[PDB]
PDB file of C-alpha atoms and ligand atoms in Angstrom:
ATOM      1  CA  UNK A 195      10.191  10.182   0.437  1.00 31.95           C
ATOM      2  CA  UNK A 196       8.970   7.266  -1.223  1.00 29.48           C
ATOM      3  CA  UNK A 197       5.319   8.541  -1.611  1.00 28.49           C
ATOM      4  CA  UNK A 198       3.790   9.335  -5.001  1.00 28.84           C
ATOM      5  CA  UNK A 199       1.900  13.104  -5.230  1.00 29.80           C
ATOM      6  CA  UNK A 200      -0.309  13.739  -8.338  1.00 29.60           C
ATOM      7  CA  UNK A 201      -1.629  16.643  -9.028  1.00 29.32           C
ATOM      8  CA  UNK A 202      -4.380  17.699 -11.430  1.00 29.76           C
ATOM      9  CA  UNK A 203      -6.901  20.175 -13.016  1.00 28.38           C
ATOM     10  CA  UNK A 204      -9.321  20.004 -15.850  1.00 28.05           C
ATOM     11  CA  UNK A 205     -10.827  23.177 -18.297  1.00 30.24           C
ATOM     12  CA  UNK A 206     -12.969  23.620 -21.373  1.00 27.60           C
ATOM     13  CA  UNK A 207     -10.953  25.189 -24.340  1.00 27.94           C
ATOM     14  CA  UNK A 208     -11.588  26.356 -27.697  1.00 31.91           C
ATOM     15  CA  UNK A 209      -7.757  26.050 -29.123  1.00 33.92           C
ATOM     16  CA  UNK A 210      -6.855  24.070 -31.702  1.00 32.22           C
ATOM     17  CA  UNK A 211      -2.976  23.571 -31.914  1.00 32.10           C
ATOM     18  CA  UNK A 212      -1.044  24.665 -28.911  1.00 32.10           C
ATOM     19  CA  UNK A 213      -1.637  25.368 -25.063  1.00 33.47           C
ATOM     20  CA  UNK A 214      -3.226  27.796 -23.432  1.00 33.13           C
ATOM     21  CA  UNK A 215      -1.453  30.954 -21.750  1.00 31.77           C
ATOM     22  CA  UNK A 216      -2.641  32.668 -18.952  1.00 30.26           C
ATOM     23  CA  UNK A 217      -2.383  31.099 -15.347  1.00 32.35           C
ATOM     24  CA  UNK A 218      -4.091  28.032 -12.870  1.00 30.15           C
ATOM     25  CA  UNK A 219      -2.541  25.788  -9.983  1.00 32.42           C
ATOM     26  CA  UNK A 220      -3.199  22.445  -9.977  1.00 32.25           C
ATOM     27  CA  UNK A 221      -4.857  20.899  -6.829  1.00 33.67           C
ATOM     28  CA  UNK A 222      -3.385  17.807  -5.347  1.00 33.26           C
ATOM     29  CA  UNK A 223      -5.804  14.770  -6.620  1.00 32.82           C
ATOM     30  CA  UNK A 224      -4.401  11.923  -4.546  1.00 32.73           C
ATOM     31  CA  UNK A 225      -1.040  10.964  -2.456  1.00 32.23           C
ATOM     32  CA  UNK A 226      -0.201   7.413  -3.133  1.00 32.78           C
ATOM     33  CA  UNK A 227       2.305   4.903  -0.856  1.00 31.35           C
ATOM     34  CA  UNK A 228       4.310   3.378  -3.654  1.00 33.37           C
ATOM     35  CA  UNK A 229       7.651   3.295  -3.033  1.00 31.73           C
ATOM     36  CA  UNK A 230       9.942   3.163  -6.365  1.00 31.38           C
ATOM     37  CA  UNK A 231      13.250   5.155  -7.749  1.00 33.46           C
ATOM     38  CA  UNK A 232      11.544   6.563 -10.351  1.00 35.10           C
ATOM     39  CA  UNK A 233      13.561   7.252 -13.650  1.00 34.33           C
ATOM     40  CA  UNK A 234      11.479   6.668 -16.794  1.00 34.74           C
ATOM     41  CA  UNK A 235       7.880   7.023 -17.890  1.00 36.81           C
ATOM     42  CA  UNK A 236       4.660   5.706 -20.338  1.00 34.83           C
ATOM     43  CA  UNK A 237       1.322   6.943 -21.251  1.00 33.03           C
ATOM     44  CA  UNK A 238      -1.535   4.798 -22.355  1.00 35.05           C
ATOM     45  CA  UNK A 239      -3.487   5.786 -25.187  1.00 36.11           C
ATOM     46  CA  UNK A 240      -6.935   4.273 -26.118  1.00 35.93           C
ATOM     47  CA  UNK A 241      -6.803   2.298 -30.347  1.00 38.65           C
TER      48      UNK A 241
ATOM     49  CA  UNK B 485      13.366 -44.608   1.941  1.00 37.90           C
ATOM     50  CA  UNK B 486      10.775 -42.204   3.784  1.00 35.88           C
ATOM     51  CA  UNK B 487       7.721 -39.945   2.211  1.00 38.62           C
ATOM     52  CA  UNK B 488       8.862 -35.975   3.607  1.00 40.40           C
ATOM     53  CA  UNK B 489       5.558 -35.354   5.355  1.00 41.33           C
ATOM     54  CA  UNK B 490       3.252 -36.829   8.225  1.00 40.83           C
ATOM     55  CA  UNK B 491       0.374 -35.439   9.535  1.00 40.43           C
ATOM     56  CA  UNK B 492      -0.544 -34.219  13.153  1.00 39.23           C
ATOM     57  CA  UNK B 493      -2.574 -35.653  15.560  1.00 41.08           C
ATOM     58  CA  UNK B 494      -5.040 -32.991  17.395  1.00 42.36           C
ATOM     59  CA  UNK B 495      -8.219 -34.903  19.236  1.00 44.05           C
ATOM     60  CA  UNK B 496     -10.635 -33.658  21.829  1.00 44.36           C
ATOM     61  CA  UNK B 497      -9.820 -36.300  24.212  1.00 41.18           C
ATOM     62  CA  UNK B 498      -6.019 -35.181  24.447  1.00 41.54           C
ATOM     63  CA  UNK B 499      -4.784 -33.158  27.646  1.00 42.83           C
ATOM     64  CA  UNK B 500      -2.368 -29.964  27.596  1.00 40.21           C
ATOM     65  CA  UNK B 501       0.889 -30.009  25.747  1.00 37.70           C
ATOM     66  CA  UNK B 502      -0.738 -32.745  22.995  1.00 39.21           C
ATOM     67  CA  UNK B 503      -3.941 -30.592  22.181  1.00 36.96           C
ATOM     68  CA  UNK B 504      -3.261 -28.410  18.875  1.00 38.48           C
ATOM     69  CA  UNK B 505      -2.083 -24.823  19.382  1.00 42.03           C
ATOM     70  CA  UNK B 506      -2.444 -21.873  16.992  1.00 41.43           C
ATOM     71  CA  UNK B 507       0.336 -19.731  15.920  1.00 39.77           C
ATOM     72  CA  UNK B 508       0.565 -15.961  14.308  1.00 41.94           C
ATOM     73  CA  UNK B 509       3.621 -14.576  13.795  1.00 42.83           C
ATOM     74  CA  UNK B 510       3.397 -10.791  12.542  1.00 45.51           C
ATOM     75  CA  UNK B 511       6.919 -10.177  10.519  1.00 47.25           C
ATOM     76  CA  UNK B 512       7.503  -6.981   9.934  1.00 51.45           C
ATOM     77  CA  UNK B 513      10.626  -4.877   8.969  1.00 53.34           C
ATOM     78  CA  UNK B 514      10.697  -0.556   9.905  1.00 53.83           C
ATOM     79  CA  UNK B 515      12.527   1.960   8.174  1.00 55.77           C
ATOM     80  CA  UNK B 516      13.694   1.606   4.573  1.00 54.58           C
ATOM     81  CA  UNK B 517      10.855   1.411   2.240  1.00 55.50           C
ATOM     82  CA  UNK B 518       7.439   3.775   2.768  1.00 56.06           C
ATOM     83  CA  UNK B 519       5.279   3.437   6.042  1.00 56.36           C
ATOM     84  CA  UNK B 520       1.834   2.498   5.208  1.00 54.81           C
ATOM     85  CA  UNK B 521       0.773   1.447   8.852  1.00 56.43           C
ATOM     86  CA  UNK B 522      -0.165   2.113  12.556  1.00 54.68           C
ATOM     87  CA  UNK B 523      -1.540   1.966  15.924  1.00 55.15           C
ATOM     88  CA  UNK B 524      -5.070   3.880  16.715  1.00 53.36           C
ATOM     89  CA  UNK B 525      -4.888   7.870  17.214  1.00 49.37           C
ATOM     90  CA  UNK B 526      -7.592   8.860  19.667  1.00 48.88           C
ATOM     91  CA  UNK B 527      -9.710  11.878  20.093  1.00 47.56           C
ATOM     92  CA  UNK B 528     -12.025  13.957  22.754  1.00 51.55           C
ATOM     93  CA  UNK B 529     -14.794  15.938  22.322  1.00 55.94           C
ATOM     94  CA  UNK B 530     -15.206  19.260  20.108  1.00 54.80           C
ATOM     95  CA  UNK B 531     -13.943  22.218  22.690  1.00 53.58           C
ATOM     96  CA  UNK B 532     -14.484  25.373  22.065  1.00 52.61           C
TER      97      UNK B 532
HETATM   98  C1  NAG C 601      13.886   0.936  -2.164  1.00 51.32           C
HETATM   99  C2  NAG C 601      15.256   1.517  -2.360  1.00 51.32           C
HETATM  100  O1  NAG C 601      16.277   0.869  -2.141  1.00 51.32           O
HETATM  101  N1  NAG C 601      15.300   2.787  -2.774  1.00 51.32           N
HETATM  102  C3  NAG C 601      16.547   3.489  -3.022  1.00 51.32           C
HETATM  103  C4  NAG C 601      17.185   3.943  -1.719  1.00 51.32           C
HETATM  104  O2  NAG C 601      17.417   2.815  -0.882  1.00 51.32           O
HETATM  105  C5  NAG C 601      18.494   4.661  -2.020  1.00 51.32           C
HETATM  106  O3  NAG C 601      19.046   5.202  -0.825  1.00 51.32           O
HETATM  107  C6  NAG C 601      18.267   5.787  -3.032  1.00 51.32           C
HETATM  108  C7  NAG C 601      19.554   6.417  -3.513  1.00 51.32           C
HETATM  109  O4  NAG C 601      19.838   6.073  -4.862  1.00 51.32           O
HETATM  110  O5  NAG C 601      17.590   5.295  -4.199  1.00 51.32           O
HETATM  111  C8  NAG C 601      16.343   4.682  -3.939  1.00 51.32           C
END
């Protein structure tokens, strides 16, 4: 509905290759106005 | 030939209909995109 919803959560881990199982839910972080058809994605990574 | 602008002349001496008026028009167009904006919401006192 032309809103953006993220979601988060942070933990400590000791793993070293692959995620975690068990269980959480993560909390919603903030709800942003944006207003965009969404259909692809990027990540920025810090060099 | 002719430059495309002139300025305007606003003094303290002129009477009404001469003397410079201010204009705000607030454009705004409703239902398509996301809302982001309105009026106040009031309130009254904790009841319990
Ligand atoms: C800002 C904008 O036009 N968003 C469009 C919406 O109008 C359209 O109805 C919908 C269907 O594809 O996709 C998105």
């Amino acid at each position: 509905d032309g809103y953006f919803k993220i979601y988060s959560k942070h933990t400590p881990i000791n793993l070293v290759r692959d995620l975690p199982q068990g269980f959480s839910a993560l909390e919603p972080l903030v709800d942003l106005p944006i207003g965009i058809n969404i259909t692809r994605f990027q990540t920025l990574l810090a060099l | 030939c002719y430059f495309p602008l002139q300025s305007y002349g606003f003094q303290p001496t002129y009477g009404v209909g001469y003397q410079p008026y201010r204009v705000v028009v607030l454009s705004f167009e409703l239902l398509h995109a996301p809302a982001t904006v309105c009026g106040p919401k009031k309130s009254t006192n904790l009841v319990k």
